[PDB]
Structures are given as C-alpha cells and as structure tokens.
Amino acid sequence: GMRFYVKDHRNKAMINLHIQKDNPKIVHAFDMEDLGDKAVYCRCWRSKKFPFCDGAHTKHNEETGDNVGPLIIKKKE
Amino acid sequence: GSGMRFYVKDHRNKAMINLHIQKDNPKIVHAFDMEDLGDKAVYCRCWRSKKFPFCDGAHTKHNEETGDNVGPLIIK
C-alpha cells in the first residue's frame, strides 16, 4: 500500500550570477548605531541595490518556484 | 575550423537558491530587533548554513563547488 517518490531540487549553480565578481568573497558589515528604522538586506543576490533588497527576489521565486526572502534588521516598536 | 567548440542550449530557469529550508513557507523572511542583538550577529546569504539564518561557514564549500563568491552579512 505504501508508495514512495522523491523530487530532487539539488543543483550546483552559482547563487550570485552577476554581482561584483572581481570580489572573491562578498561580505558586508554594518554598525547598528548607524542604522535607520529598518534595513532590508538581500539574500537572493538579484537586487540591483545589493546588499539591500529591491524586491528582485519575487521574480526569482516566481520563475524557479523558490521561497527566498530578505533579512530585516529593525528598531523595536 | 576555428579551434573553438560552441554550445547552444535552451531551457527554462529551474535553479533554486534555497534547496531545503522551510519549504512550507512560501517566502522566508527574518526580522530582528537591533536592540536585542548581542555584540555581533552573522547572517547567511547562501542558504547552505545548517544554522540558517545564521552563517556557519557553509558558504566556503558552496563557493568552491560552484565557483561562486557569496558571503555573509555581519551586524555589529
């Protein structure tokens, strides 16, 4: 009665296709004390305002069926 | 007769960035209050960390295997 199957989503594609490829490892570092009310940081490597999110993730998610979204650092209520 | 080999391919974009994390969530967003961070936090931007949303160094393997150049976000 039991039936088994699997969907394989593994790939070896680069995550970052185009951003600052002359940098061998892209790291950003910010001080909390110099942030505004909210900073929305990109985790999809498609934003035209990288390291900030510009909503590019939605196009990627729609295309590939992915579910990636940004990291938000904000001021508490 | 050029010495070049040309490859012309044609297919839809199927490569997900996130392979395994919280797949029942249609869009993964994390939001933290800056006041409640410690002295430092390091956030994964490669979706490979075993401690996502935190960077555990998994990006090194990804970059070596794929030729990529991704790394984390540090808030301090």
Ligand code: FES
């Ligand atoms: S544009 Fe990349 S996470 Fe929004």
Ligand code: FES
């Ligand atoms: S483990 Fe993903 S950016 Fe470090």
